[model samples]
Target: EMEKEFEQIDKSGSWAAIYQDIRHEASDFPCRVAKLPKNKNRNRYRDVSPFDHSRIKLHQEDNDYINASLIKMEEAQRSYILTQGPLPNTCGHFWEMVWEQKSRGVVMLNRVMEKGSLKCAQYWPQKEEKEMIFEDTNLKLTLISEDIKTYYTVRQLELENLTTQETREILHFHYTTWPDFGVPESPASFLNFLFKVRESGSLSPEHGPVVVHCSAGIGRSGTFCLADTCLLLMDKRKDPSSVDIKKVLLDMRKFRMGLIQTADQLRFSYLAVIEGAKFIMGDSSVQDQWKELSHED
Candidate 1:
């Protein structure tokens, strides 16, 4: 079945060709502030732009600007605020948006430093650090506890409004191993991180939308959401074959441009979904299979 699916992917043309088509279609969308000459440099990449219609709208004293999009999936009962990694100047606004939207968690798929360059700002407080205050937004973030694992780190961050003195606990799930424009080495490690986020109830609708971001907010971030959505839908419908992966991915692209940015990322998503479905379908040996395939243990 997986081989047949791969054949269908080939029939759609090379994944790179299809990715280019999606990029071309996205060029027609208005970029709003994200296109402003001044704001372009704030974005991590030129090709990764946010669309106006579905992008997050920020309210300010006299002006509003941010590179982020709110993606609501009613069928999956999930909402994700997908945004580029925080810029040095934008970190304050980033926290403000998180507080205003009442987000419960922030999923970080990229590192602050990658390939000897800054992929994202050091937005959260680190261990032994008392707190990181965003003076622009008058907000404070304190790190309560941090659990470091082999592949990921989960930190308990307390976001506080200094003026209002209101605070909320936000889970910071950082998948530390994924490289730029590349997929994780194996599905098991990625799924392990995904399920850890799930077990924390951060992705639950009971909380506000989870804030998901990578360096560009489209590549690795998109793969994470796409895989989770398909696996959940498969489990919900009780049919592994019920999900039309391409359809779900296309529908999601309507909300954010250039999602699953590379052809490699797209292919990785499918593999993750296929591997994840075995667990959902109650395959007794699936755990062993994934472990052996992933060599995670």
Candidate 2:
């Protein structure tokens, strides 16, 4: 059914119509906390706020709202904290959420600067600067290691809570080449990067939800989670054709609004899921093909 749907959509070229239908279904979700005066500045974009029903709440007494949603794909045994790129002031809150949630990794889908625009703040320390201190939350982030690739970088970060003296290693998966409001160049490249993240075991259920963010946090983030979950579902069923992409995406939309932002993004998710299904279905050569297609060593 899933493969058939993909073929139908591809043949009909009706990605826009299908994407619009999902957009309309997600339009009525309420974002009450994101609209509160005190929480207004916490959100990167006023228009792209997390819905109240599934938003992640901070443990702080005075301030608890953060523009992050805990999206749980229970059937796939996957969960992700979907949030916007951190603002200068809210960077502390961002780390606090990571600490409180016990998240093992942070998946950054956008670069700090995109197309000469500041898309996200530099939330972590760079190679030159070994560490960054968030005074507000008393959290310190130290760069442990860096492994740079053609399109992405894998960094090991040490997050420490100064007050508690507790520290944790957080994997930082940064996909640099993915365009803002657009899909990656190909599903092969995207899946290649995704498998890199998977190899780390940071996304397992034993750890906290993997914190996934882009500029606005919905478009690329949603696409990543969707493709990953769909492939996992296919793996569990052992039948690539059994999973329904549209139904799974619609179910995921219940937790966050404006997911898979554009028709192209939606189409890309389908492509990535279909491409990923090949590997899950026991084609070992699929990995080699993906590596060659993505030009990854």
Candidate 3:
């Protein structure tokens, strides 16, 4: 009987756990390391691979984390804006947020950044030999980095400097988090930072538009802009109604592209976002929209 039982165990990979379970007096199953599956090409596992696999030579190409390309925007000279926030180096690359109107709001498109890389930390301006083409009014200019840039300009603690309004333009934000709430900030921190940003006296909206980049702007920008836009939407209605978030995202995508890149970009669960919305706006969800985000994990 013991001989036959051992034979059975030897034949069954599923039964292999039974031996470890018996020896260790553990319940259910034993731990046995299974061989990892192999692929034709060696690649690690990923939940969301931010690569453009469709590109013919994916491995050889420069994946500055830019999954999409707007050749037209590159050629025609356009600008894009990302909200002011530092992106973690673990998830930012050179994929920049290109803008159109000299420096107006993000006009054309969006993209991702490479992981774990940064340009040399020095002032790099454009030149004839090598340049990053950016449109300035009617002419094309090779744009490069300076000591600062701005998104929305503001005034701060000093009078003379206040007049200058040292702006924390979007480009300065490249090294900051993309403003995703879950990254590290609590509500208190966010409030303090928001004011500090204003106090820097470094933001001037008259700058019109600037660029913002993060690992992925979809989530952070979506969350921040959603907060800003929903407030605007609420003021308009007296008898009032509700704005569907799905509809908002759809419209957002049309204006730019891929507003809510991933569901996490929404950050707050519908329940969380809505309950807070109720505190800010009177009506919360009557339907079960919030349940979709609730999972057992």
Candidate 4:
């Protein structure tokens, strides 16, 4: 009876009808939905991604630099936040504190979300934040804001090589995110984005450590990290000889339960990988996907 009523109203051609049916029946796609405001547009939910970059004072103790004192950043201050994250999600152990070759300060970029669970996490932007980010020899910082209206998930990557006046752009193929939504069917879209990041590559040196985080910075972060690196290595004809995909996943699981932990979650990523490869090869057609995997088996 309820389903029949849903079908009648589903004529609106919105997610409303699909949501109603899933609410009552079995759903193969499992997602945790955020309790959203009734009148708010769902677009705002995932539109803006916040990267809080700022300066913090630190003290070095016997060759080990521990965070001494960190403070909020004011506008006009430059931040050295990473523009990208890693792929092939390894155990959260592959971390090295990177210091600005010019600045003697130390900062850490977390690959997983163990520090503070992004449970109901919200990244709002502050109007005061500068349009650009920076990485100096002695300092790495960015404008910090928890304000909701000030965030940019897909931003125009604009930077100036200050001394040289060299500038370039960071573009997004599809500037959208899944917030309380299902998996992105187009993983290739993500791969393309990574390719863009690869062009510039690294925050400091050629092997630059990027930062990858999702709501919790665990599951999706791990997914992004692993996939990105694999593509990079493949480009160099370097087989993931030492890179253990499974081990990487296990590490992510250790930090957070069920990050690549469940069989389905695990399977989803592999499928996405296959799809991403196809997208990169110009075989984006749904039918072209067959030839991509026909050789796998």
Candidate 5:
């Protein structure tokens, strides 16, 4: 049913209809988070809300609120914190959440500066600046190492608790080319980036859920999580055909809203999942080609 839904939508190129159907259904779905009064301090749009069930609560004494949600696949043993990009003031809360959760990595899907707008805050240490101290959260961030790639940049960040001087290394994987509310030009490139994050061993359960955020932290971010989750399900299930991509997406929306926001994003999710399934089924050609293409471009 899931495969046929995507196939029919793609064959007819009627993505708008499917998007409308999903959005309309979602409208009637009771959203508990939507009822919470908007906090003037959090840098999020009026429409964005964190569901109460899986929302991450901070450990601090006061102002324990942050715009973030926890998404977990109980059977698959996979988890991720879908969160908004850090605002100027919320940067402390962002890092504090990472520290409190013992997160080993942060998968940032958007750039800090994009299309003449500030898409994300400069939460990490900049070049020549050894460290960034967060007074509100009483945390200090130190840059350890950085590996720059054509499409994505990987940085090793060390977050330390000022009170206890305890620290943990966080891998920051930043995908540079994905545009807001749009899909990557090639699923191949996006898959290469996703595999890099997986190879880092940061997403494993030994550590807390990896923090994934875009501008609003749902559209492109959701696409990454959805494709990854579907691909993982295909790998684990004895029959690849048993995986229901659409159903998994609907389940994730129960934790956060507006995931895979646009029709293009939805289409891209199917494409990435299909392509990733092929790679999982012992085809390394796409992986090799991406390596060469990454060098050429």
Candidate 6:
């Protein structure tokens, strides 16, 4: 049914219409916490705010607000903390949330700077820098290793709580080739990167929710979660066409507003879901095709 829906949507070239319908169906939710004057500076974008009902509350007295939402996809056994790209001051809060949640991975879908504009603060330590300390939360992040690939980079990081001296390993998966407000080049390429994250086991329920962000934490981040959840549902059902992508996305939007920012992104999600289903259906060659299509070495 999903495959057929994709085919019908593709044949009709009605992605925009379908996306608008989903947008209209999203329920209005309160984001009062993000609008408080005390928390105004913590957000990267004024218009993009987190719903209070689902937002991640930091573990600090009188300072619990952060522009992040805890999205629980219970059916897929997937939980994701979706948030805006950190502002300079909120980097500490970002790490604090990750530390508090015990998240194993941070999936970054946007670069630090995009289109000559600051999209996301450089929240992590660079290769040359090796370490970053956030005094606000008394947390330090040390880069342990870096693996650079054609479209993305994988980094092993050590997050240390200065007060307790406790530490944890965090995986940083950065998809560098993905543009802000745009979809990846192809579904194969996106699926290739998605599988790379899957192989790391960072997305498992055994860990806390994976922290996923782009600029505003809705567009590209939502796309990633949607495709991943749908594919997993297909795998669980043992049928590639059983999942309803539109319903899944609408459900995700309840946790975070304005996901899948464009019709192009919605269309791309469908394409990725359909392409990934082949692999879920036990088509070994599909991965080969994906690797080749993605130009991965």
TM-scores, all models, native as reference? 0.90, 0.96, 0.36, 0.38, 0.93, 0.97
TM value for model 4: 0.38
Better of 3 and 5 by TM-score: 5
Evaluated against the true structure, the overall lDDT of model 2 is 0.89
Descending-TM-score candidate ranking: 6, 2, 5, 1, 4, 3
lDDT of 5 by residue, 1-297 (tens): 456777888889899987777776662244354355545667467778787777888898776778898988876679899999989989999999999888988998998888899988988985546799999999999888888887788998888999899988899998988999899868888888888889899888798998999999899899999999988887787356787776777778878888888999988988888877777777867776766765524
Residue 178 in candidate 6, Cα distance off native in Å = 1.0
Error of model 3, residue 242, in angstroms = 2.6
lDDT of 1: 0.83
- Over 4 Å off in model 3, which ranges? 1-115, 118-184, 187-207, 238-241, 269-297
Residue-pair clashes per prediction, in order, are 0, 0, 32, 20, 0, 0
Task: Assess each prediction's global lDDT (C-alpha) against the native.
Answer: 0.83, 0.89, 0.30, 0.31, 0.83, 0.90
- Looking at model 2, residue 292 earns an lDDT score of 87
Return the top candidate by lDDT: 6
Q: Give residue 199's error in model 4 in angstroms.
A: 3.0
Over 92-125, each residue of candidate 6 has an lDDT whose tens digit, in order, gives 9999999999999999999988999999899998
RMSD, each candidate, Å?
Answer: 2.7, 1.3, 18.5, 16.2, 2.2, 1.3
Off by over 4 Å in 1: 1-3, 7-14, 17-28, 37-42, 284-297
Candidate 3, position 286, lDDT: 19
lDDT of 3 by residue, 185-275 (tens): 3322222223233333223344423343333344455444443344334434521135444444444443333344443334332323333
